[PDB]
Swiss-Prot record, chain B:
Pfam family name, one: Ribosomal_S2
Modified residues (N-acetylserine): 1
Disulfide bridges in this chain: none
Gene Ontology CC terms: cytosolic small ribosomal subunit
Protein role: Required for the assembly and/or stability of the 40S ribosomal subunit. Required for the processing of the 20S rRNA-precursor to mature 18S rRNA in a late step of the maturation of 40S ribosomal subunits.
Name of the protein this chain belongs to: Small ribosomal subunit protein uS2
UniProtKB/Swiss-Prot annotation, chain F:
Family the UniProt entry places it in: Belongs to the universal ribosomal protein uS8 family.
Keyword Ribosomal protein: yes
Any Pfam family the entry gives: Ribosomal_S8
UniProt KW Heme keyword: no
PANTHER family: 40S RIBOSOMAL PROTEIN S15A
Protein name per the record: Small ribosomal subunit protein uS8
Native organism: Kluyveromyces lactis (strain ATCC 8585 / CBS 2359 / DSM 70799 / NBRC 1267 / NRRL Y-1140 / WM37)
Swiss-Prot record, chain I:
Family in the record: Belongs to the eukaryotic ribosomal protein eS21 family.
Keyword Ribosomal protein recorded: yes
Any Gene Ontology CC annotation: cytoplasm
An individual GO BP term: translation
Stored PROSITE patterns: RIBOSOMAL_S21E
Organism this protein belongs to: Kluyveromyces lactis (strain ATCC 8585 / CBS 2359 / DSM 70799 / NBRC 1267 / NRRL Y-1140 / WM37) (Yeast)
Pfam family, one: Ribosomal_S21e
Major subcellular site: cytoplasm
Protein name (Swiss-Prot/TrEMBL): Small ribosomal subunit protein eS21
Protein function: Required for the processing of the 20S rRNA-precursor to mature 18S rRNA in a late step of the maturation of 40S ribosomal subunits. Has a physiological role leading to 18S rRNA stability.
Alphabetically ordered keywords of this record: Cytoplasm, Ribonucleoprotein, Ribosomal protein, rRNA processing
Amino acid sequence: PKKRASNGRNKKGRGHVKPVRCVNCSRSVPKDKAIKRMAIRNIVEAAAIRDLSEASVYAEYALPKTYNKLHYCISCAIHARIVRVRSRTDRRIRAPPQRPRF
Amino acid sequence: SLPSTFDLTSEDAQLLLAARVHLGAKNVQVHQEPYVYKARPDGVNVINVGKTWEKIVLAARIIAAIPNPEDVVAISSRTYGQRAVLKYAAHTGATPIAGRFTPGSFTNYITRSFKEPRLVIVTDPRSDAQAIKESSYVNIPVIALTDLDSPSEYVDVAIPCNNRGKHSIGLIWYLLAREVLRLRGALPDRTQPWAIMPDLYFYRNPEEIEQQTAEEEAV
Amino acid sequence: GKGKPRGLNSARKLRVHRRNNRWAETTYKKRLLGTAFKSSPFGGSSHAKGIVLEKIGIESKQPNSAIRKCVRVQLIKNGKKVTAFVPNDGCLNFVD
Amino acid sequence: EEKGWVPVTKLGRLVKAGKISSIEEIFLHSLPVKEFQIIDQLLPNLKDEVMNIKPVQKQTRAGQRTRFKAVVVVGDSNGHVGLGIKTAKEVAGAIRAGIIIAKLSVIPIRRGYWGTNLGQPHSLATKTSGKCGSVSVRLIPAPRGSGIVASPAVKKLMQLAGVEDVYTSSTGSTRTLENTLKAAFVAIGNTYGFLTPNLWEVQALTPSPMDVYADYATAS
Amino acid sequence: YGVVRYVMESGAKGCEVVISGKLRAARAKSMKFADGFLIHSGQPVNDFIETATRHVLLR
Amino acid sequence: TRTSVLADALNAINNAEKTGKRQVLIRPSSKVIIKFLQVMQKHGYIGEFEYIDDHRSGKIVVQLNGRLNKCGVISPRFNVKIADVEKWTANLLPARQFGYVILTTSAGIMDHEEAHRKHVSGKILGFVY
Amino acid sequence: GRVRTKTVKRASKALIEKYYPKLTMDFQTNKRLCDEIATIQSKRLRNKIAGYTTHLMKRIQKGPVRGISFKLQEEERERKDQYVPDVSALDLSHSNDVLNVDTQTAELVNSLGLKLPLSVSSVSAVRDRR
Amino acid sequence: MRAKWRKKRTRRLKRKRRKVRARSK
Amino acid sequence: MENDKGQLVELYVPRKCSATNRIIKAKDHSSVQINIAQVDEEGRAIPGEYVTYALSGYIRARGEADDSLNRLAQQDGLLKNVWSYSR
RNA sequence: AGGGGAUCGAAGAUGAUCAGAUACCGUCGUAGUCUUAACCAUAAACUAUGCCGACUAGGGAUCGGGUGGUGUUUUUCUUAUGACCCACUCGGCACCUUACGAGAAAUCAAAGUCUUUGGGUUCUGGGGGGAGUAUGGUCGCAAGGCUGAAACUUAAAGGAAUUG
RNA sequence: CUCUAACUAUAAAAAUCUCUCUUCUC
Ligand SMILES: [Mg+2]
Ligand SMILES: [Mg+2]
Ligand SMILES: [Mg+2]
Ligand SMILES: [Mg+2]
Ligand SMILES: [Mg+2]
Ligand SMILES: [Mg+2]
Ligand SMILES: [Mg+2]
Ligand SMILES: [Mg+2]
Ligand SMILES: [Mg+2]
Ligand SMILES: [Mg+2]
Ligand SMILES: [Mg+2]
Ligand SMILES: [Mg+2]
Ligand SMILES: [Mg+2]
Ligand SMILES: [Mg+2]
Ligand SMILES: [Mg+2]
Ligand SMILES: [Mg+2]
Ligand SMILES: [Zn+2]
């Protein structure tokens, strides 16, 4: 039976979209079904912020960030903890998991 | 029909305006309510206060027709209109239900809180949906203080007013109790303002009750 | 409204649609193809005589463990050979 | 036998005081009945018949925990029926609670005439129908003395109703007795849900019995 | 059930009966009848609830 | 494409009755709809309707009073011999004591009882009860 | 793993709600009170009951807590509830006997056939971006 | 079995039968 | 409904919804019957004398119970211009 | 068939894992992938929901267009645009709530207006397997496509959901 | 009754299983 009225794809009116490859397993998966996670992080983590600050010319050098949109597979997404199985009445909710920190 | 003594007296309309009953309905609207009038450019629809007062007097007429006082049961789950309900049940011989309304309080006959009334008054349909469903299951009228955004399912005569301010709910309960008492005849004539005060039905935060006690115990 | 036409002048397609659908049944298909006369051991025949060729017993299925006493008979009307069942308890010896 | 029946409902209190005389007052104002003793008081001669006892099992880690579903039909053969369906551990308790529910769920029916009216109504008033699960039951009026043309369970339901002549037609998996009896119950209770030309004039809305006699309730 | 009814009629705060054996069937089975509440742990099991075991011979 | 306009009218009536309303707006408003609603008025299953001239096939506003429970067209207007009238009444109407198979005769659009009184029969239009 | 199951908690709650004036802060005095005013069968349960009663008494002394209630606390709540300010919070006692309304509710007052002291002010229909 | 592989085995049987017929056509 | 002698044989004539003219089922456990007290000259609710409106469960579930009661009370001279017949 | 020939990669070549591994992991790797002509006509070609038409219920948003605002920033002194804001409307992919309707239910705002059965119309199915097989046509260079049974066998196969 | 900030980062191997199923009626 229909486990998902949206069929998971989130297409509803296109017929075909261009597939994208998985970052981990390189699975040719449609760009809308594939789970996209925007990893924006610090090029140097808090483990070395003090060290870099002390040992860098250009006082108050604003260190750069690194941005990458990761196109996960879906088997990979289940396995790499990116996305989790949910209750059948909980699958309804599409809002992200409530702002991890404020 | 009703004698012209039951028209919107100037002081009562002044009180209704002061408590900001009209000022806020919603930035949205549901077509179950043609109680709206002149949607304000601030996107906050105005409520026709005359219609609200007509609804109030109609609800008072419905309540006064009940032969035995304590089959009028008044519900309030949300904080803003808790105290007022209690105060209402103090003056009119009604039965209050404040805070949590235990489910099965109308259908289940084995609960020690099982009340079988002939009328239910609800401070907000969206918050007291459980009371409304319970009234549905046992053929009970629901006089709900509906706003221009609250749902009107299983809701009989609906006083249109505000639900996002304590002033509006407190004064609405005041007017309802006052007109019920006038209809019954305990209050002799319906012109004197019934000296007790609208602020008696207003909400009281525990923080401000502590502050008031501290100001009272300073001397 | 429904799949079938409804107009007052649509008798033709209704009739031919029913006539094409009737082949979906098994009884109607057997009756019209007349497979009973051509293929079955008897052509529309309730009974038929035959000659006993040999005297066999056939094992039953899983849930039932026994050997039912049968008999191979060649039909005389056309020459086909079919196995048949000797019904009752001590009737196998009766038929030689 | 031993029966006190302290009334816990205002309707029960009024009935015990003897203030409601006929069950028509209960049915008219759509009053909610929660005490089976009210129905016992109003209809002294409610016969029954256990339509079916069905073993229903739940698969737990240890064995199969089995209960019994009783399908009881209660009525007086004079235009009053009720259909209780209960599940319980012991079969006798299942039947007791089933008749108990059936008495709680009594309902009135509108017997009519197939053709011209000569004596008391012998059949239903109009065609009616109900549907529970996939079972849809269609009750159709029949001429006088035509019997009850229905399956044995539905036939017993009509006999408990008082309908003497009626045609029936059932579609679906009418095998399942609870679904068939529930569909027939829906139809026969829908018989009073059909507006008919002889039922067009408006009435005066006589005040509710618990409004005029509210004082005798509310045990003080 | 008559025994349980009589016992609870006597003023007991709970009765229970286990009938185990070949109840109208070749396979063994145990029927449990109870009413009230029966405790099971602590000498309340000795102070209040009293038990009795018997064998009955049938054909 | 609107094929049977009377079907649309009666479907709108049924939808606006089941929801409990007291009015319907039927758009195309032919003769046959007018005669159908006039018969319903004569027998009371309808209230006080109204024709709104458009110069464009007109429209109709129908007032109800909840007395009706179902209209409905027999979309293929079957030729109904005077012998088959009882057959249609049995198959369509819920009881013999009431209900009316509205059918179109050479003497106009009439309820089945009136047609049987004139001893004339024609094609069948619909049914009301 | 000391959690003080149903019996001790309910018994201590009833003890407080029926005997608050007699209860004290001290464990031993409340233990003797538990002996005299309640028939606890054993003595370990008596000690647990007195201990939780003392804990609940200390919590009450710190302030008002949910669940339990008694005559003194309910009377104080009712007295605080009966508070009504002699000064008026309505009828334009503030803002120099002037209420601020926009045009629309002013037309409401006008069309109602009533003459109230108003003060028109546009509501600047431009909405905040939030 | 999957319908896919039953179909493929049928196709291979048709392969053998087609080459046999072609050799003897 | 009526026997040829003219004696009633119906068990009871059911009430009908005062807003939609639809009958009220015996087990329609959502329908309500509102009572509105008559008012004399000085605003004293005369006891035991009132006007009753039977609202069906259907309109209540739909969400039009209050609107129907508004119109019905306006028709019988209870509320002044609370309901406009033209939306 | 002609052109190209980077990547990735049916076959193949191996190196591993294993009891076996000519499978999954790895490294190379033809045909193919990319194209100009000519074929092929099949996909879980799926919304597993035929098309046209009417009506039925509340809530927001979104895309294209159009109306009005004594609206806001825009700047070219003012204005005209544009871009927003508010209200409305038409059309589209959609979505949330609910049953007062429908369903065996999962669920559907259509899968509603269906035993209270008829708006027009096309195609398809009649238990499972044999079987989308054989045969006979027909299309194709080939692959294969379209059409498409029976003999016989079987009491089930299957759908949704509940507890383990 | 006014509000968009923090974060990473695991995939070795594991094939198969001979019984037998039993009534709910006050
Ligand atoms: Mg699955
Ligand atoms: Mg997804
Ligand atoms: Mg499209
Ligand atoms: Mg214990
Ligand atoms: Mg222990
Ligand atoms: Mg090439
Ligand atoms: Mg290889
Ligand atoms: Mg190898
Ligand atoms: Mg590889
Ligand atoms: Mg490579
Ligand atoms: Mg295909
Ligand atoms: Mg398909
Ligand atoms: Mg088949
Ligand atoms: Mg197949
Ligand atoms: Mg061929
Ligand atoms: Mg399944
Ligand atoms: Zn992947």
